[model samples]
Target chain A: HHSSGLVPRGSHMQKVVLATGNVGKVRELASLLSDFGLDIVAQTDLGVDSAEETGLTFIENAILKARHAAKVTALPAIADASGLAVDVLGGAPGIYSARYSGEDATDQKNLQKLLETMKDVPDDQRQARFHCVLVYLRHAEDPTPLVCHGSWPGVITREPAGTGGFGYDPIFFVPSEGKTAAELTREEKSAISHRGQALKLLLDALRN
Target chain B: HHSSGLVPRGSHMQKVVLATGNVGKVRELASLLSDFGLDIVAQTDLGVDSAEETGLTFIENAILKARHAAKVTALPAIADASGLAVDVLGGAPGIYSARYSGEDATDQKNLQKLLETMKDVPDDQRQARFHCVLVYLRHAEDPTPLVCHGSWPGVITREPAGTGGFGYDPIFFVPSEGKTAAELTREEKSAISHRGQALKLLLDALRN
Candidate 1:
């Protein structure tokens, strides 16, 4: 999506591949680009292969998938790999937070697992943060991948308190608002969300 | 494989898992051992899941595979993920250099494709390096993995020229001698090969 900083003035098409499978993600992306003129395609659009999220770091995984897609189609691509990193856990799930419990992990399930494991962990010690790293992998010589980082700092709650966000959101409290991430509306959350911040930075590098 | 620097003063069974399916790799690893006290086992002993190395950087890929093996097998596993990087192509293959030709790539086939692509690359511009990084993931909470790096400095030949080592070895000409990597004898090649340096570091880490 073209944030104000993205896409040169009066550029055409602005076609770019969105490297994610979540439809909700697509909807959010649409909103991000609503004011701009651009076309975004996901892997499903071209039946591109999805690598297992087998990377040790978010940026590494993001760059791998983006480069794979760009190389296959020779199209410039954007990708973001992100996850919740609990501070008490010392970033334990920093990269594997999505599949922390297992593949196909749900919001409630993942949240519960985190709570169960941290049952002995105290409230004050449950500080955590979510990190999102976006990448633009250009398919050409000297085109080493570039990365931008964003974060939402907060602490984990003792229990799930809301139902809006996904994967540990209900239990991950956004201290800025003294409420769980899941308690925030989609529009409200995106306004100051880690991913939202990250997208803004990513757009700047590409379009500006 | 016991290097003089390795093989501690006392203790037994270093227990290193050679993280490869290639019997040649097994033999090569055997030659890289730092101590007779070290008992080498293949993936069979560790029962390591075949995690896809889907990371972009060679370093990240190595860490992912090693961590997977360590977590699954609960052994101090040694995993190697290697790829050929040629300068003319701006590190074309990098971590994906192994399967650069395509999915289901063979050692020779990968080599062939590289030479064809670089057919017009001049010798001066052919300067490239083979890099390998070894990360030892011994425990689930191992804070940080021990990382060691190795590299082979060489140039790309005008054509594929040797028959000894694997991957782009045939097209990689060593500066020490006026011959392609593939042209060396097993003993001679192993003495200065990329894998050789990588394993050298691995042994150094293990014995320590």
Candidate 2:
């Protein structure tokens, strides 16, 4: 470990790749890691394609994504996967949330079905959690990849509310915040979101 | 379902693909499935590429393989994934037996490491099981793909045995047969092996 509790301070300006084409992921990660002295580039910027998420678990998929990007770009890579697990649904839309409304799933379509399925479910039984899993790899074949997870507990609302976040945020009411995730400002959501928490842990890990 | 308890007789000559390039897999499956009248062809023959196995479980990996082949060939596809889970090692090599030694895994390297790591372990405590998971997809997007699992309980030998099989077969002793898996004849192994049992269940499912 370095005296600064980070990578060799003198060996600054290294490069790391984040494996996702989504602008939200790229922007959030780039902002959080700005002072790390590492250039964070998107896989698409280097013509790297996304890997098939054939894994049934978040950790497996995160590792696959990080490994694929690292192998393609020959640089350290970071990947994250998130899913919604509803208590009432028994985690029905865990990994299949994107396809819950079938092949042509839109954000609206997914939310619609989720609402319909939970229509009969009482508000008290509408507990749910958003989980995020992060994986960091030094190389494509790194045997000791670092993994971390974070979750945001919430409850499903009967109808959509705010128009901020793109996914199921509108129907997800954050109890501590007393509002739907969509109603929160970017900074507000980042402070307590699952991805934000997981990334925080990842940054701490990088420091050590 | 037909009177004969198989797929409709008229569709008896349907062409299904096997998702593997291994000659051994091709030969074994072809012989076993001949009477079913499904024209089984290797994925390579149809120019179908192998899918990346990124799943954490055998069932997940098998589905990925089958879906990839079925998507490429636009026909039914069958895929199987097997692994040796050592009880004493706490399933150390569960889904990762193929790459247990390292990324560039080989029969000799994996065998050497398994033996060395197990040197101090007693014989009675060396219990292990060979697991095989099979998936059959009627199409690339088959929602209800048939999945089956079979296992062969056994013991891990201190030294490698018969030269007949590849990979860890030499170090895997089948208690029921009173010999290493490598010592069994092709016919004998087929009738009682984990893969064989899984395939039997798959066949039964297909028949009904």
Candidate 3:
């Protein structure tokens, strides 16, 4: 069936597990996928625990998460793996962006480490992008998985700004919007964010 | 052009850069792609060094490597990312299979570490597989890139076996073949290897 628009509360075509425990990710994804008319619910809502994300890259991790959820719940599942890739660092803190400081690293520590690492680097090479890969798996062993990737290009700010979003948002400067990611409203970020772009691709794929 | 068969020697049709510096990979790929009739050359042949494989998964790494080579050489490129995933270990050494022991890790040392890690494991829990992903890009910025994956199911042996293949081959037991992967001949491996299976899918995608 085509994803024409958001369906009324009475009729739903399918149920898909959002394979993530992070409330922020779940909220963002739920909002983005609202128009698909799929009953998207978080895995935790069904008492399903998150799987160990041992995958090395964003796509691989997303696939593992989605497939694990799909298999456990016997339902289609959606998941995403994402990170900030700094150009000067040659994409360091990419897949490991979340734990760049250490395994139990917090957001502040991650942002701190990144800023420290970029301290001596020149301004010209400060270009970076927030990258995301979203995966939709029909089943655990789906042969033809749907995948989409989006990147929001920007520069890294010397100091943190605003108090919106999460991860490295406070220091992620968007030249087009002339504001850090944290400074953007939820709706504004949703319209121009990397995850938003990837969701658009996924929606287009489903539409046709 | 359709890659149905090898092109005539005098009438060159296309060129693809094989983005790898390993002599072994170059030789193996050249043999497999011989029927495609494309002028396949190694990246090093054009003085382009291999890109830093910073990706966390086979596909991500393959895409990065392929795009890097294609951009610099201005030619279509192909790359592969592979790993040995052990089921009991939750796919331990999935992407880190190459550097399991250390950066300069040798085959025997890597084998020792694996054996030590699996000593207490039951025989039935020793399930593992060799996974490979092959990526072909028409250009650096090409969308709708051709991608394929293959997984060879097997188990881990208590001790190492024959010395035919490299890396973890000696410790990888193929039940159907009744020997370790190291015991299989080049042609035999080509028929059942993960990389071989992925190549089949890639060639199929190209033909269609």
Candidate 4:
């Protein structure tokens, strides 16, 4: 694993930075990485502001943020960028999922815009998936940083259906469960969410 | 699933470019992707020159090549970058594996240099693996190019063992096979090689 050189397995606990302001991500990553003795500190807590996500893709953006935090804090950093990709839209609202509505985009507004745009689409054409690209950089200049990707297949509902999770969760319908992402309990969501799946892959990489 | 938008399932045969000059890779990839109804033409055969591998990691380099080929040929492109990563050397000769012995390096010289460097290192400490990062880009500016990775674990041999394979194959000892990579036949190697594994994942991605 790329991390073996940075944080040798079975070594002392390492203070690693999580390069994001999302508390939900911070909590989830911290818990998932605890077994590896990684002390996952949010970049915000360390007074490091978010980097400009100027990259065109989720992987590039995640790497940019990870490198930014690692360079600023002089610590190993983990970062992720995620979005919803609708098949009918040619993978639109992809890297732009968070700001789909505009500069003043809010979760509610973004979901509303997608709902309205997709309202005319039939059930079979509503195929979409949540994509998460998570990256771990040992340093700003690390050439072989670890990258993990996760995707959760689902369909887009015409209207919001739940109140729990954030982002486009309410309209992202998981077919297997017959419920929207927001309808799932925290534990249930974390167990099968895109971010959760990526974190699990990251943990496996670090362990072996 | 990202490729669905580009080459819809059950669509007519697509002419895709293999963004590499390596004939071995071209043959292997063409064979593996034959079932997908793709005509894998080499970029070089189409008058496209190799891109400068200026990226820091294998994934970036693969994407760079794929995008370059896609831009020149106006077709979907696939490219891969691979290297030998030694644990004790902190993954040295990673992205630089091709020129590890200097600008005019050859397969023989590169492996010789690696063997000399680990002359005094014990067998157990000579842990290494062949890492391959393969990427598929639908176009020059694809924001969500498909990425796949594969790794083949092995220990560095004290001396070259066979003459069938190229690059570091002669010195890469696969413990399970009880043979150096070069000792395996083409079919056997393709069944377990790092590039083979990554290509398998890429095939799965395109198929589903």
lDDT values of the candidates? 0.68, 0.77, 0.78, 0.85
Q: How would the candidate models be sorted by DockQ, starting from the highest?
A: 4, 1, 3, 2
**Candidate 1 lDDT over residue span B35-73, tens digit each:** 556555776555665778755566666766766766676
**Candidate DockQ scores, in order:** 0.05, 0.03, 0.04, 0.39
Off by over 4 Å in 3: A1-40, A43-77, A80-208, B1-11, B31-35
Clashing pairs in 1: A6-A207, A7-A207, B1-B33, B2-B34, B163-B182
Return model 3's CA RMSD, one decimal. Answer: 12.6
- lDDT for each residue of candidate 3 in A1-208, tens digit (9 for 90 to 100): 1111223354665777889877887776677567767778899987788788775456767888888898899888888888987767756677788889997899989998999999998888798888778887766654334677877888998889999999999999999999999999999998999888888887786665
Residue-wise C-alpha lDDT for candidate 3, range B103-125, written one tens digit per residue: 79887888889999999999988
Residue-wise lDDT of candidate 1 within A1-208, one digit each (tens)?
1112134255565665667766777666656664565566776677777866655666666776777677666666677888887756756777777778887886667778898988999767887777777776545222234556777887888878988968778888888787888999988888888898888876565654
Model 2 ranges off by over 4 Å: A1-10, B1-208
All candidates' chain B TM-scores are 0.83, 0.88, 0.88, 0.92
Model 1 segments beyond 4 Å from truth? A1-11, A30-38, A140-143, B1-208
The RMSD of every model to the true structure, in order and in angstroms, is 9.9, 13.0, 12.6, 3.4
Indicate the docking level reached by candidate 3: incorrect
Report i-RMS for every model.
8.3, 11.1, 11.1, 2.4
Rank candidates, TM-score, best first: 4, 3, 2, 1
> Candidate 4, overall lDDT?
0.85
Q: What value does the lDDT take at residue A113 in candidate 4?
A: 97
**Residue B142, candidate 1: alpha-carbon lDDT:** 36
lDDT preference between candidates 1 and 2, better one: 2
What is the Cα-based lDDT of residue A104 in candidate 4? 99
